[PDB]
Assembly symmetry: C3
Homo-oligomer: 284 residues x 3
Amino acid sequence: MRGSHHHHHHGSMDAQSAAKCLTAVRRHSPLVHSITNNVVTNFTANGLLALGASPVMAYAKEEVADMAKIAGALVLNIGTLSKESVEAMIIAGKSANEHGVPVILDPVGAGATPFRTESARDIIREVRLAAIRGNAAEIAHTVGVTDWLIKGVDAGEGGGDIIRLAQQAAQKLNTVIAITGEVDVIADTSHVYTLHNGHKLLTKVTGAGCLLTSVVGAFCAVEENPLFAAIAAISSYGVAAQLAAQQTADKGPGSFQIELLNKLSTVTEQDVQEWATIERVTVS
Amino acid sequence: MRGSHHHHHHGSMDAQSAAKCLTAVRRHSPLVHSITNNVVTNFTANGLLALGASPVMAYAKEEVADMAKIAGALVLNIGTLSKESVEAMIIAGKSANEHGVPVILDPVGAGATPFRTESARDIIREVRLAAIRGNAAEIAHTVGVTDWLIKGVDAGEGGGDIIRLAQQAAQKLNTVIAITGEVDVIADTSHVYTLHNGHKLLTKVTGAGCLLTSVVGAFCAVEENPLFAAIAAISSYGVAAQLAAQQTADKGPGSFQIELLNKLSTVTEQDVQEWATIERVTVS
Amino acid sequence: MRGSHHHHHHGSMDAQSAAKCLTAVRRHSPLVHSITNNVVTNFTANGLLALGASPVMAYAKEEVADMAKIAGALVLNIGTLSKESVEAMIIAGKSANEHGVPVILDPVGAGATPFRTESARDIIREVRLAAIRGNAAEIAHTVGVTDWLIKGVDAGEGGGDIIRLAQQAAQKLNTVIAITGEVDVIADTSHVYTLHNGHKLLTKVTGAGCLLTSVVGAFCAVEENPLFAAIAAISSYGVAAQLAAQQTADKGPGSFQIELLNKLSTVTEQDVQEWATIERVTVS
Ligand SMILES: Cc1ncsc1CCO
Ligand SMILES: Cc1ncsc1CCO
Ligand SMILES: Cc1ncsc1CCO
Ligand SMILES: [Cl-]
């Protein structure tokens, strides 16, 4: 089911190709194996079901190798990590690597404690990753940006710094780096894009980001290029979120959470084509 | 308190009696002890509360025997099992057995990985179960395929193939077998029934089956005969699910999940007596 | 971010001051580190985000000390405790004590099993707590090392005994004791208050109490006096609950839960000032 829905020889990844990827997810219902934190398990599963994917949660070292080998994508999330779960994530990741199943990492809280930072690097060192999704601070700490410079990530300013961070981190780790924030930045070793969809309400629902990383996995299961896969995932999620906010912005984060689940199931190819905002960044 | 709300010497289980058990659950608010997966814990607890029962979750080997013996029912779910949690489930089940507390099992994933099939089997070997609730494949692979026939060529589900599986499994494991899905069959050693109350939207809510097994536990806490208890539980859940679906319409799986919790609370004894569809199967 | 929003010199704690603390919580978005049960993690995080706080969940002994020292408050909840989690809770509490981070305890199920009663007591013995939040029975079983320690009249149920229970527990443990029920009673070593806000629908939402404890934590992060912080937290929460009920009372527990999250976000200073019912108990 891992097809090719876009190629740079035809131009920059765009809304139409993103919309195609979404339909492929609905069509193939990829099995997405998540080894995530216990604050977002139920939400992640429900979000994936709403979207049209097949979620599976298995954490036991006695069975993670077997589950990951048959999955369409593997997503590792250290939100509530333990030494045991980190072990399982690497066992699952190696099985995934051996079988060609793309692996996505969400380094939740990397930088907050040495344990999270090191566990994130342990995974990167022991597992080949198709992509890493996180906020600017988490990415900077994970890749090793020098202490004193990290501050350069604070506040909310853009136009190059965050864009360069993404490309430099991608070049260093040889993977796709997706930094979400006021403006989202996605890059691989030689290409960079900025995405402009979503709604601030997402910052008021726990797991909004964790679920997003799982959605990136679902798209990575049907699109061979993780960059394009991630761009389509984030754009689709963002449109779904904007549509959800229109119906609940005035009600509150509770109604919005529920409506996001509804929209992930009702958002159409037409919606993405019409509202997705994807911009290629001139790199040179 | 567990009593008898129906006897075979009073006819075959019917909606009338099912509604009576629902009222009994709400009147006694039985304590239902769950040792389940972290993907459905919150949803399971909220569903039981809405229904009218009192949920409690306890997993540590240092207390499961103590919590189980004071419960009205113990429910074991292997959704996100670990070697340690299964050992805890058995310790809990044995305490329940020694104190006369009904034990219900949900063999989630049995047949998907060897670890899961064997874990389900270990529990069955060490714990006397009042009932087992799961899908056809999970029941078949846990008991082991003996009878293969059902129907040739993809045409119809038949129904007799599942009825056969249910009763055979009930006889082999000497327990109540509740198989749910498109079919829906419940049976014990000498009796078999078919229920017809559900909705496809349940396939869009994670833990929809896990919560259903917990509800079966709530009913077994007040109805002495597990066959009657399971039938009442599933019928009531099914009616609630139908009402939730009506109210939901085309809103989405998020709205439906919320409405299911609402209806488990507002569904009435009269609603059950009216929509519960219970068919006793005449096999010979 | 921990300032003082009231002083007994200006009289007793009142709605006006409660309102100010709420605003303080939203201004600082205090980081609330919770080591809680797996049935309420998502609800707890979502509730804190809606309120305006910043939740973080960390449980591994490899990081709980590092996470606690940078938090605004530490919340310990034994709902689904394990030998490992209790150990981690104490490690986190000691670290928090070393840095002046307020620690709140929710002795869930204390008295139901010896392991929980013992565990609750081990934490109290090893960690200086700012406050303990639970129901009458849990507080009674926790402090009642002997059946005579807490002096009072033994009879059916309890009420006026609650105020006396609170006073004695607060004096014996040297901390703030918040007992919630149809009527809430909060006390420290020298003052006693009863609160009268909220709605019975809260008994139908799992984690309603666990979240409240976390909210007490968020307020303690911005108000140096734990008694005052606890009153403001419980009053604000109750008001949000009444407002949510008014719009959900006849829909069901599912709708209510969602509306509670909405209201924790939309409830204003004015709402608290007008609805919060705080009464100082003339004791002497
Ligand atoms: C806030 C939080 N803390 C640990 S995991 C988590 C969920 C990410 O949204
Ligand atoms: C998605 C999931 N993972 C383990 S159990 C479960 C719920 C089945 O609906
Ligand atoms: C009911 C329950 N059982 C274990 S923790 C818990 C959450 C408190 O509401
Ligand atoms: Cl967990």
